[PDB]
Structure 1
């Protein structure tokens, strides 16, 4: 009886890559690699989407993948805030846009004004 080795549905190349990518990202993070984990975390999603775009599978699959895209996307967002925190201090913007209050008060009332005078 020749075993009919056959079950796991033949997955697409784009999807497979997305999985491996995402997996690698984590492995790096734990190891201590954030800069590398970030990139991967991004790619994984990029591919995942492409699949659900045209090479999709089913309403059930779409969500299954999407859920991962959001998760990985959020995780990466953080690695960025950390990578920049250590990265060489970022110079401050000059003449970009300073905050200011609304049209100065209107009514006028008697009062004091303690200031350098």
Structure 2
């Protein structure tokens, strides 16, 4: 599950810089979904949760932004 979080989170951001948005938007939500998923069923410390959390916001922000700009 973890490998999917980064694999999905990496491909998502890779598309953001490349130019893609539709595929990056879907990957963004999916990638972030795995991040919180593992955290919900695997909480070691605060440093780990603090990292995924901060990353979940940045990625989530782009998703909501692209979805808006894409429709607007």
Same fold at TM > 0.5: yes
Which of the two has higher C-alpha Rg? 1
Give the RMSD, CA atoms, in angstroms. 1.1
Say which structure is richer in helix.
2
- Which stretches of structure 1, 4 residues or longer, exceed 2 Å deviation after superposition? none
Q: CA deviation at 1:52?
A: 0.7
Q: CA deviation at 1:56?
A: 2.5
**Higher relative contact order, structure no. (Cα contacts within 8 Å, ≥ 6 residues apart):** 2
Equivalent residue, structure 1, for 2:5: 18
Question: Structure 2, unaligned stretches of length 5 or more?
Answer: none
SS of the aligned residue for 2:44 comes to: coil
For residues 60 and 28 of structure 1, the distance between their equivalents in structure 2, rounded to whole angstroms, comes to 27
Q: CA deviation at 1:35?
A: 0.2
For residues 34 and 27 of structure 2, the distance between their equivalents in structure 1, rounded to whole angstroms, comes to 11
Q: CA deviation at 1:55?
A: 2.0
Q: How many residues align?
A: 72
